[PDB]
Design a protein around this ligand. Structure first.
Ligand SMILES: CC1(C)C=C(C#Cc2cn([C@H]3C[C@H](O)[C@@H](COP(=O)(O)OP(=O)(O)OP(=O)(O)O)O3)c(=O)[nH]c2=O)C(C)(C)N1O
Ligand SMILES: [Mg+2]
Ligand SMILES: [Mg+2]
Length: 539
DNA sequence: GACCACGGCGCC
DNA sequence: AAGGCGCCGTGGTC
């Protein structure tokens, strides 16, 4: 409350105002610090950064990232957002956390510093009692924020000249597709407008509508509808292709080259640390956790992500991670037995599906099986199965049934997990990360059963996220020792960059750290690839 | 301009 | 009604 001259005493909390939300791109407008009942406003923010030992307060990682951009090794420390998010993962914004735990998120640095201190006191008290949440804070989230700050500030190289050239190629293909669509429709229209497309497909052409949209009840034109309609009229396939090319061009090919930072010549995402219900990170501005890889054009975009000249990318991927976690949480003996004997479930399902042997399973088979074991696992109705393979029932009941007959303890674990969630109001990961799911007790079946699929999924997806975050915290100092860089995390994958002659040693070490992160009832196995670009590194 | 809801869709 | 995200264009408001 009392104005004191900059600089603040050790241990102060910082408030700061940025000209924009992305710290790699922002001007530091103001900087203050609060300790006891004094607030210190720095006359020259940038200068003032130099006097700090660490960035401590709301959104600390943001300031640390900016400091790193200016060549200061200023790490983030305590952040009330991380405390709030461990207490309840619905705590995602400083606005929400302040309203809930005792202040108001304003636009003034001194008020943000004082808010940071107050909220930290109140949240610390709430979190002190909780051994496992405290453990997650001090051993996972708080150090992870320093790791993320360095990843953000470091960035990842992009082959711009390559993408500009790809843009023109795809633009000309898009022209061929839309002209062909307009010819079949008998007139031009805005093919990007799904309202205009709806009228053309179902009113002008005689195509049958298959589904309706959720909020406004229009006849849907989604890929799923179109796919069911593909053999009904030639325009449909053209539209599917048009949709793919314009999606990839508008979201990746065109924007990415314009996001290259002028000082680094790289792409700098944001790793949002308090943004998901399950404990996963999210990525934005740009999102680098959803770069294409599935289709041919998608792979071509993936190739644009490259190593520094003289370095290589190293991509590490936990194998069947959520199934391994499921084996451990449930203690199902058959499941555990599959991984203990180095077997592959996705492969075996692909086998089963395509009428093929284990030894023969195109990777496209596997990828198809992947979202089927996960789909089924997480409450996919026998119904929607029908429209993944073919004719039910008992072809779908007995598929979802054989699935659970194989691993009976899983059903038990699910019911057990739901029951505890109803009584306690929350579920939790292996490490005690929790998610409150109040709708487990809803008296409307569709709402309640949606709640249930969210609830029993969280311990599985959340444990895998705990495991990866813990692996990042352990791995990071080893990397800097070896002169390598951690660049990206994509949920259960890590992408590193290393000097060519160190690349294999780094891969090898990183793989071992990730597999031994926290021994379970089943081994964790990590596939690793090395390449000059992200695509070739994932093999 | 900036923002919104919606439908749609990229990845894990 | 598989789970978890963030981003895009359209159509419209302000
Ligand atoms: C876009 C792309 C390529 C990605 C897809 C997906 C997905 C999905 C991923 N996951 C969850 C569960 C997973 O454990 C964890 C990580 O998932 P992957 O690494 O892709 O699998 P996994 O590690 O099991 O096996 P590998 O041995 O790595 O192969 O995240 C899901 O719950 N649903 C999915 O559809 C599908 C198949 C839809 N795709 O076409
Ligand atoms: Mg994986
Ligand atoms: Mg993966």
């Amino acid at each position: 409350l009392e104005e004191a001259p900059w600089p603040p005493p050790e241990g102060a909390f910082v408030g700061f105002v940025l000209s924009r939300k992305e710290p790699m791109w922002a001007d530091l407008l103001a900087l203050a610090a609060a300790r006891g009942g004094r607030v210190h406003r720095a006359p020259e923010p940038y200068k003032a950064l130099r006097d700090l030992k660490e960035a401590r307060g709301l959104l600390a990682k943001d300031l640390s990232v900016l400091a790193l951009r200016e060549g200061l090794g200023l790490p983030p420390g305590d952040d009330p957002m991380l405390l709030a998010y461990l207490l309840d993962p619905s705590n995602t914004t400083p606005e929400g956390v302040a309203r809930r735990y005792g202040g108001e998120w304003t636009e003034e640095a001194g008020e943000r510093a004082a808010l940071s201190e107050r909220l930290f006191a109140n949240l610390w008290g709430r979190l002190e009692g909780e051994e496992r949440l405290l453990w997650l804070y001090r051993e996972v989230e708080r150090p992870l924020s320093a790791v993320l700050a360095h990843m953000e500030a470091t960035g990842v190289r992009l082959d711009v000249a390559y993408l500009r050239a790809l843009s023109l190629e795809v633009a000309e293909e898009i022209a061929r597709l839309e002209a062909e669509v307009f010819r079949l429709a008998g007139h031009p229209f805005n093919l990007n407008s799904r309202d205009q497309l709806e009228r053309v497909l179902f009113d002008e052409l005689g195509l049958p509508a298959i589904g309706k949209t959720e909020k406004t009840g229009k006849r849907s034109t989604s890929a799923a509808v179109l796919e069911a309609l593909r053999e009904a009229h030639p325009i449909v396939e053209k539209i599917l292709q048009y949709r793919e090319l314009t999606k990839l061009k508008s979201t990746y090919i065109d924007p990415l080259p314009d996001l290259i930072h002028p000082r680094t010549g790289r792409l700098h995402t944001r790793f949002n640390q308090t943004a998901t219900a399950t404990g996963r990170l999210s990525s934005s501005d740009p999102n680098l956790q959803n770069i294409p890889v599935r289709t041919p054009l998608g792979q071509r975009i993936r190739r644009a992500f490259i190593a520094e000249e003289g370095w290589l990318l190293v991509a590490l991927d936990y194998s069947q991670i959520e199934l391994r976690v499921l084996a451990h949480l449930s203690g199902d003996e058959n499941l555990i037995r599959v991984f203990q004997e180095g077997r592959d479930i996705h492969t075996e399902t692909a086998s089963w599906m395509f009428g093929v042997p284990r030894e023969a399973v195109d990777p496209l088979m596997r990828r198809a099986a992947k979202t089927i074991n996960f789909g089924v696992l997480y409450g996919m109705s026998a119904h929607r199965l029908s429209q993944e393979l073919a004719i039910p029932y008992e072809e779908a009941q007995a598929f979802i049934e054989r699935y659970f007959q194989s691993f009976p303890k899983v059903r038990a674990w699910i019911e057990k997990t739901l029951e505890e969630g109803r009584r306690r109001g929350y579920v939790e990961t292996l490490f005690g990360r929790r998610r409150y799911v109040p709708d487990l007790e809803a008296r409307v079946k569709s709402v309640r059963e949606a709640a249930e699929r969210m609830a029993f999924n969280m311990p599985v997806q959340g444990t895998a996220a705990d495991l990866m975050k813990l692996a990042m915290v352990k791995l990071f100092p080893r990397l800097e020792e070896m002169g390598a860089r951690m660049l990206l995390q994509v949920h259960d994958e890590l992408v590193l960059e290393a000097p060519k002659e160190r690349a294999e040693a780094v891969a090898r070490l990183a793989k071992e750290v990730m597999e031994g992160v926290y021994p379970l009832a089943v081994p964790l196995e990590v596939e690793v690839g090395i390449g000059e670009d992200w695509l070739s590194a994932k093999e």
